[model samples]
Target chain A: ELPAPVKAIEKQGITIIKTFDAPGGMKGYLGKYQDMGVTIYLTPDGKHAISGYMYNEKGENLSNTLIEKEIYAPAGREMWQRMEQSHWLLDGKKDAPVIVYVFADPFCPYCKQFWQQARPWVDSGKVQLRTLLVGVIKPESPATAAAILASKDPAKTWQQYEASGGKLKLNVPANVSTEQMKVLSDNEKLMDDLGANVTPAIYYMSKENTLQQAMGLPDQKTLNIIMGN
Target chain B: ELPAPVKAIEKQGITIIKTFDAPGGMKGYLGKYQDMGVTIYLTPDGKHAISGYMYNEKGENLSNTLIEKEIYAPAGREMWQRMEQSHWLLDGKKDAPVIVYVFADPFCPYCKQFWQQARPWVDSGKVQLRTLLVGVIKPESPATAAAILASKDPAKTWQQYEASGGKLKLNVPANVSTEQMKVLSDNEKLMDDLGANVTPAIYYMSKENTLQQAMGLPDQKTLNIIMGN
Candidate 1:
């Protein structure tokens, strides 16, 4: 239940903090508006910023405080054109698999599970899986970005890192700046348009336009079915 | 792609259709004037309608057509309430079980698969399953009504009927009336509110009021999981 002042403000359908950058930093605003019956707060990004609300309440924005901008990979259209010009992945030829796209996030526990369970399939195949890192729940993460950029051979590095239980003392720093976050978001948007969501999203496209998805971390049984093993 | 005339009308926001009902006798309609590039289809009862617009040269409803009045179940709330009151499965229970209420057309192939694949779990005491007799595709279906109401033990009857390997015959006479269809439609409305968009949609209620669902004919593994076995 809300405090008396909070309840009073809620009765009027008025939010105390209209907008702020921080959700946790609303303590000062809550103190001032609690007595005035202001029952809501807004994040600086104009997101929901409401922690709890009653069903009987009307006309309140129920948005979350952290509004994540969508991101995708393959970068700019020109870059896409450039990659195309290079006959990249040999136009998705099974024999000359050029581009490997993996939709993954660093923080998801399922991601860890996937690396553990599906590593055998990756090792058995000649195809290399590219990492299209999406920030998803954790935006502005520098460690994740460095994990993507620092690897000379990202495919091998990812396998080694996951094999090591993701406990590497890499040179990558934490707390990514806003600019890095924007780049990640934009890249994710492109991949999203390509119809990929969730972690460990793998796409194996051949130059002949044959597309295959190594969805979720398939167990040995599923991998056998896919590979006709 | 939309025809030139249809595309032109859409620029002005209007639509036109030759017939109201669809191939299966489902209700459909066209739009004219002002949002003229759109189409409006009357649901079964004609109480409410769904609207659609042209997309990629095809018309698609911008809103969901599956609605309450469109999918009526039992005619009066009293009869339905009485049916609820008469449910023998609830005897001695603190509350009702999450019954598997199916609003199925007899001829739907998917419905047949659902029963075949999911029956074993229910038979083994792994899950509690009950069904509602809903006649949507086959309105005025006498055979359907009799099949549901004929047996003193519906659960057993349904099991045997589905086991026959061919289309289960509706026990009601072939010449059922529109008024009877109306009753079925009313019951369908109630079922829809329970979140059953298709036949064989299973809803489960746990002891603590938790509701889980198996939307379609799930595999044996999924059935076991849902049964908490």
Candidate 2:
């Protein structure tokens, strides 16, 4: 049963998802405030309430675990599906055993580092990397990304671009199609929707069929752990 | 009834404090891992579990509110009470209408700024500022804090120290009392307990008697709002 205070809060347009018994005889109500999620505890008698992040006796944030399970996991899955639908440059054979998705910005140094580290595995034909190119790092990145997408051979061009230490001249061909522009814009939106601000955001499916993500340049050990190797 | 996974976690020495029904038919368990608080969600079948911070559909962190209500509030209250018991240098009338406790480091510029801004209110006898001096900012802070504590008139010494733009000598008097040293050390521990890492951590009782805290130097409007002026 919903407490009267919680019901009143809901009447004010807040979405009360669920109510639980909190410590010290309080009632915990999980819900949304505007578009932002919120949780509050109604006092035992339901007259008073407490709201904000809670830490434990040793100052560890207890709410983090709940947030990860209830929020990020579902969001990540949806993003994974969206990326699966997008056009990405492939770096290995279609029948390769393992597949991973990487969001890359043309001018990001960390992205270059990740590419360098993953090159050996990629050359061995053991893993396929789907690169989602976006232009978020620098002013000239959009033209560079557009050029890459409009190229006759994007995967080879990307290899050459990274191989040249990102010094390759990026000139958008005169015949660049609207579909190619849309691809670049769509990739940018996907990055935003996934909350990936930095370059080289890596995503892969774990053995448990859950979406796992990492930001920045992950070393070999971290790559193996996230990829279930 | 407690779920089996939660019971199993408890057997591993985690304290299961409260359990709530979460969205998507999951069970949310709020508890402590060792002495640090934590929150985890169990699958509907009570087998699989997820731990760490959770986000909402819009990527908002939902667990932050839960942590604030469940963990930080209670801990802040206990620390507030401890601060109330300690001996601190007072700036204003002993019977001033409003009282605020400020944790200060001698070498912190922001602490001096807060002191300067609140001078008018304190001088007018409208607010009493209880200053808890600690030596955590710089190498010379301990001797400076000890000097102020050992002075016959600490309030004046503190005023001179700040008025001189922190250029006052930090020589510890040869006869500095053990009790004074203990007070300084105790104030440091209290700051750690409150999880206040920066200077000028201010705490005051709100109109509803709830303990409210703010970090850094609050502007005039923020000061009024926090002090309930």
Candidate 3:
């Protein structure tokens, strides 16, 4: 049972995502405030609560494992599902063993750099590159993205445009279909929700199958890890 | 007495800066790792500890105020003392009511923009802008900084250099003296310790006398708050 104190933050919009019994007689709750994950523990009587983590006699933080299991794991899983559903341009074989998600803006040179850099993996047919379009980098990005995604053969059109390193100006149709515009805007919102401000943001599932982000582009060494090499 | 689990983290190099009797018979410890401040609470028997914040029936985060008081206040005071003792170039009136610390690189154009922007308050003798020279911005920054600080009148030399918008060709001397180099390096270290990667980092005492930072260049509205207008 949640005490008044634990419910207090929930009333103020800190969402309680999960709850469980913690070490000692404490009742634990996993919560989120904006994008921040927070943990709270209520006293045995539920009169007071502790916001943070708990440590046992051996000085081990008991809350760390639980917070990760209850909060980050589920959130990562949810975001991975969203990545699967996003309007991403395919760049490799359909039956590839490894799938990597990349957020790219048509106007960003670095996005093209990563796209070209990933060619070996894409050509290997064992790795697939799914590029999510975002329009944050340049003013022309939305129009260019709409042009590629609105085409009948979006995958081929995207490939041809990216191969040109953004030099190929695909004329944006005067009228953008409502469904196509919605998908383009949705991808931008997803990028925002992923908390990325720049282009070429890479997302990949770790060796442990946990969803992980590369932050930005990778160096030669980290690129192998990102490409599952 | 620290419990085994609480001591476990301390043994792992998380420094416990302060400890006190917490509410609900818990023993609270304020600690730091790198630049992050952490709060840990131990059970009444001291066998287990909680890391994060504590909440009462009202749902208030008790650790918020305490962390600010115990950790941030002392650190800010220490840094403020260091700011006072740094080899800062002086600008504006000696008896100015408002003393603002600005970390500037000799090669940064934005530093000149701010130096020019604060002219009204500076010339009115109501504000003293203390420019702490750091050399992280450009290749010529260190040489330019050394040249300015090595001058007999460093304040005037810096002002004269900043006035030219970095176009002035100040000749760096053949050999940099040991003392001047050490002071310049110390200022750079201070800027690093302050966690500012960019030039023109503004530090000021807020209206409440709490130490605060501007993060980066402010808009017109926030500029007033930064300058205490």
Candidate 4:
């Protein structure tokens, strides 16, 4: 339905500055690189590490000469920008003090739960939130088409979307033409450029273009931290 | 895993393109804007036919209207070229016949399978293959480093690669240095430009500069057809 919490961890303060060589093996890491069979570890100092079991062609452990490769902290200012550029923008308020972007799929139940928790932040004006409808799993579903049309007036539509008690309404306006459909297609292409392979991608950004904290629906205290309250 | 074909209909030759109307319903046929909650039908001979179903705001099956409010095809040829030009040949072999680009993960089991399938084509001189090793999944996997080094002597190394069974020896050749690693890193960026979201992403091109197909290993017949044999 939506991207997991691990996918939502791309934010400014949560810096993966550099990948440093791990002294130990791939234990106590946050996640595993499934394709590579390598475990990713987060050091106490905040940088990330990667490790895995190594063996020779004869199936002998080369663990004694285990390579501990570490990437130094990102050297350039562009590093953070390069990382942050691949994110969704939530609010229309371009100059707002706090900008929040939530990448969610209309079909995800957990994202629905996340929205329930996020409503207060939008209503309170402490933050201006924008929801980028990233159709991850149900990209071609009828509900997705309905959701795309509804996202035009997202705040109002989202309110009505919630009031419906979880039924997808496919009653798109009659005036929609082949031309408009193409536009939606183009928008999907644009979303693809943002590096969103999964959905439920949430980001909290300050006015300075610095990524603040990023996660799914943050508990109130975490939300407060995101808002710098 | 390979992508499954949903419907395996025989490839039909292109003929008269079908045209449908927009803004109004169903090819400018229906006199009145069809009401919600009804189904409509169109004959191959161009006749407006049946209609069905009905529902409420709580969300029901409202039909009768045209299924597509709009339709769009790919834009100008120039635009398509611009959009798809990112996957060009790195070796300046853009105009070569049977251009084959591969997206591989050195540690991927399926990548090994793909290589097994591809070795014959490369050896037979029927295909011009350019392989890219993506390290995103296993940034520092020993297998990836070996493959990068091996690619330096592509012809002989690919032979050795295929002979080594499913895995490569862990020896990172002493000749491979930090500078060489930088070049490898740049090549990975080029692969990214090709929009390879998955591994074993094989792309095929004909001499006409048309991207005939992109996927995993194609059967000899299909590959031959794509190669204009």
Candidate 5:
């Protein structure tokens, strides 16, 4: 049972999930407020509580371990692994040192911009761009994805589509094959799982080796770093 | 100049402010991220840094203290006493079971929502809402607020003004009296001191009698309890 002071927060609409061990006799209560997880640190005297993250003297985010494990890490790790194994069209040398993952739609003008923006690193063989086809941007966008991915030479078809600024130079398909439809479904699901609703959702590894994501059109500096500059 | 690792954070858009002493050999660097002031905790080893709040195991918001001192201060007896004697328009029975202090603006639609929502409890003689007139929302908001609070009968004027959905029914002076201007200035300073930057910030006592505040219109459940449900 929690103390009266800490439990009093529930009246504010924060649902206490469970209590966890915290530093310096401070009690840690994992709580859910609004749409995200929040940590409530209760004093040793149990007379006070503070809602938000708590860090140690080392600047270590002590509350982060519980938060990420409870909410972000499980889904994130699974998404990263799924992306690594998913069907994607590569647009650069297979041995490129830098790898970038982009959820691209064939009918998106933004995706076309991102495609061309990657050309510097792609041509230099310093970075690789992997386009994970998704079709949630516009009407018949899924069919456009099918047309490119179902082609005999999928890589060539995607390259041509980007080169023409996403023109339907390749025969646009009204319907996709059973396997192609599954691919489209899974790709769209993956996009949603990653919590992106827009086209050209980009992902790359930081110099610190952490997975980082960017949405919409990136600035020149970001594009340069993604291109292994 | 800062250390390499901490300085590297500048590349990500965090402008580092001056550093301060922290417990356990940790260093505190108050930084501005985006628009808000954030305290960064650098580890004793200096090999690591955490960007967020740091606690002392007593549930004290050490980081918040830094942010408040630098950005948002102390809120309790001093603040409560300040509010009790402030130039606020009473909007309910002089004696009520619950007392609510709200920093209100003439031009904020959100404040209108709270004012309207509190009418039921106020009408029932269960709660008293004291509108601490703050002229901070719009350019003309102060003048409108001054028009209401500086009127012959501020309570009736405020009631009619709120009743008319913040209409300037009164003949507002182009320039208020020196005392009127001071009241406006002091109310605004009070808001800043209370760590609020918006209109309709509500303050009340929790079931535990602890001071609790909501930045905007509270959820129905919270409003009910705040109204002494």
Candidate 6:
């Protein structure tokens, strides 16, 4: 149960998500105010508050470590759960040992680059790549995404389209079903929720069983590390 | 005092900066490993360890607040102290009520833009601007910076040079004193220490007497706020 004072502060529109006992008998609260995440320290009695960093006698920073463990990582886990639940076009073997979820735009060159790099792992039957198609880059992106999803084999169409450097000729359906369009919109929502502003946003389960996410096209060594290889 | 295991890890080149009491009876340690900051949590007995996020029953993060309050802010304060101690050329009134520190490169266009925008506050004799000249942008930058510092009236020469769009004719002195050259080099070190990679990095004392720093050029209203005007 939250302290009454914290709840009162929350009523003022600050979203106090987490609280912990801090050094010097202070209470630390992780909250969101005006869209940006902020961590504030409250007095032992919860009356006064201190915002910003706290240092020890050795000039060491204890606040940052707390934020990383308590705020960023948990938020990342929530995003991972959302990614796991979203609909994605599957490529490679279903029973592959590793599963990687990717948020990709139809017209993103970097997405194509990542796809090319991921081919070896996919072909070796070691990884299953789930591509969540989104259309946020260009005017024709929605039409292109709809065409790919409406195809008889989405995985094949995506491969061919990417191989052609996004210039593949396709016959898009005049009217895509509302259900089909919903997948693209939902993928967009998932991308936004993950705070992934760029294409080729990749997420994978690490050996520790936690979801790890990275943006942009990673090199081969980094891809191996991300895949737990 | 660090635990035995943490000391052993520190012997392997990791710098364990701070430790804190974390949620669920874990001990959190903030350290630098491989040139990146990381937080690791150990069991109460200091045997078992966990890296990454920890969450409460309500799915709120418990570590982020600690990191923000302990790690990043202290580092920022250290950099601000360095900025305060660095030697700089003065502009505006000597006894102005407001003081602003700026990190500038001779050949940076954006720095020139900010200087032009700061004219109002400077001319009003209400703000004192301390320009820390740096010379890392171009081949001619070091020569230009040295020339300005070597000039009989650096403040006048700087204004004339900037007013002419960095195209003003400059005569490089035959010999620049070692002490004069050290000032330019020291400013470079200050810039790197602050993690300020771009020119026109500005710092000022906020209304709360805490140091505030910003990179790149800021708008007029933001400048006013930074100067506590």
lDDT of 2 by residue, B90-205 (tens): 88899988889999988889988888888778888889889899999889788779889998788878878877887776566987689889999999988888888888899987
* lDDT score, candidate 5, position A30: 88
Q: Write the per-residue lDDT of candidate 4 for residues B19-54, one digit (tens) a residue.
A: 333211222122222221112222122221212121
Q: What DockQ would you assign to candidate 4?
A: 0.01
| Per-prediction TM-score | 0.29, 0.42, 0.44, 0.28, 0.48, 0.42
The numbered model that scores best in TM-score is 5
Model 4 C-alpha lDDT per residue in residues A1-229, reported as the tens digit of each score: 2112212232211332233343322222222232222322322222221122322223322322221221212222233344335333344354555655655665766667666766565566666665545445675533454454545655556545644645635456655455445534544554464554545555554333444445455677866666546
Q: How do the residues B118-226 of candidate 5 rate in per-residue lDDT, one tens digit apiece?
A: 8889999989998888888788887788887778998788778778886545677767888888888998998899899877888887554556688788899888878
True contacts kept of 5: 0.03
lDDT of 6 at A224: 86
Per-residue C-alpha lDDT of model 6 across residues A163-194, encoded as one tens digit per residue: 78877777889898787799999999888877
Prediction-by-prediction clash tally? 47, 16, 6, 16, 0, 23
Q: Candidate 3's residue-wise lDDT over A1-229, tens digit each? A: 5579988867767888888877666678888888877778876656778877676776556676666666667778889999899878889997898999988877877777888889999998979998887667668777778777888788888788889765665667888777778877888888889887767889888665677777566899878888899
Query: What does the lDDT read for residue B170 in candidate 3?
Result: 60
Report the Cα lDDT for candidate 3.
Answer: 0.80
Q: Which of the CAPRI classes, incorrect, acceptable, medium or high, describes model 1?
A: incorrect
Ten-residue stretch with the least lDDT total in model 4 chain A: A3-12
Off by over 4 Å in 1: A1-229, B1-99, B139-142, B151-154, B167-186, B206-208, B219-225
lDDT of each: 0.44, 0.74, 0.80, 0.43, 0.76, 0.74
Off by more than 4 A, model 5: A3-5, A25-27, A42-52, A93-99, A120-127, A134-144, A164-177, A189-197, A203-215, A219-229, B1-229
Give the lowest summed-lDDT range of ten residues in model 3 chain A: A59-68
When summed lDDT is taken over every stretch of 10 residues in candidate 5 chain B, the lowest stretch is B69-78
